Every structure is written in C-alpha cells, then in structure tokens.
C-alpha cells in the first residue's frame, strides 16, 4: 500500500531476499506476496550478473561489513547517478546484495550469524533514501511492482 515505501517494509524485503540466497528458513506460512515475486526475478538477475561480471567480481574481496557497505554505496552511487529510477534498477539492488552476502559467506574475516541483518539494513537505507519517493509515486510494492512483475 501507500506506506510500503517506509523503512520497516523495505528492510523486511531486503532481509527476506538474503535469507533466500543463504537458504535460511524463516518460519511461518511464508514470505509476503511482494517478497515471493521479488525473490524469483531478483535471483534470475543475480545469476546473470554473476555470469556477466564474473571477471570483475573475481577482483572483489568482501572481507567485512564495512567493506560491503562502502562497496555497495560506491556501486549504487554510480548505478543511479543519472537520476533515473525504474523497477529494473530496484531489482538489481536486491540482486547485488545477494552477491555481497555470498562473497561475505566465503571471505568475511569475522563472520557473525546476524551479518545478513546488517547488510540488508544499509540496503534498505539506500532504497528508502534514494528511491522511496519514486516507489510511492509509482504505486509502491503492491500497486506498482507486484502488478508489473507477477504472472499474467
């Protein structure tokens, strides 16, 4: 709905997607309708990004949450610097946090079970601060994203 552009909702989407990538079970009936649609398309994109940018991503060592955060912000700053926002770009934010959590799982010097909660937090910060107004104006997750990305 109208308020699904606020932090708590976005943070839950970002956390849900990292739990999907890490194959962590979140108990209950399941993720929301938004998350269910987002996880499929974000994962498809993630696999294509991993393949297309494999040589680039081989030079990427994500050894700490602080490196993950600066790298994420550097990548997102450049991706969005032309001022354009669309749902495809928003999907790539989720795909990229999935890449970061996989690199951390292998490379993090001092891993902690709550790491995915810290990554998804700064991801939600970026989405809210840089795309939240556009999300709201375009129908939010329920009337915008899901309507365009759910099955016909």
């Amino acid at each position: 709905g109208m308020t699904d552009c606020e932090f708590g909702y976005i943070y839950r989407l970002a956390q849900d997607y990292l739990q999907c990538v890490l194959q962590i079970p979140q108990p209950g009936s399941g993720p929301s309708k938004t998350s269910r649609v987002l996880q499929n398309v974000a994962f498809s994109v993630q696999k294509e990004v991993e393949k297309n940018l494999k040589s680039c991503l081989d030079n990427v060592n994500v050894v700490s949450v602080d490196t993950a955060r600066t790298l994420f912000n550097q990548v997102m700053e450049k991706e969005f610097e032309d001022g354009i926002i669309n749902w495809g770009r928003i999907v790539t934010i989720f795909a990229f946090e999935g890449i970061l959590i996989k690199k951390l799982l292998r490379q993090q010097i001092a891993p902690d079970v709550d790491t995915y909660k810290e990554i998804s937090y700064f991801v939600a910060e970026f989405i809210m601060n840089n795309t939240g107004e556009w999300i709201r104006q375009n129908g939010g997750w329920e009337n915008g994203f899901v309507k365009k990305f759910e099955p016909k």
Partner: peptide, 23 residues
C-alpha cells in the same frame, strides 16, 4: 575501478530488464 565498472554495468542490465516490464 571495479566498483565503478560494476555500477555502470548494473545500470545497463537493469534498464534492459526494465524494458521487459515497462512497455
């Protein structure tokens, strides 16, 4: 250099993806 290259390439892939849903 790598982060900046990744960002530009994510933009390219995102806009191609987006065109399949924004007609």
């Amino acid at each position: 250099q790598w982060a900046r290259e990744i960002g530009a390439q994510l933009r390219r892939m995102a806009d191609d993806l987006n065109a399949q849903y924004e007609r």
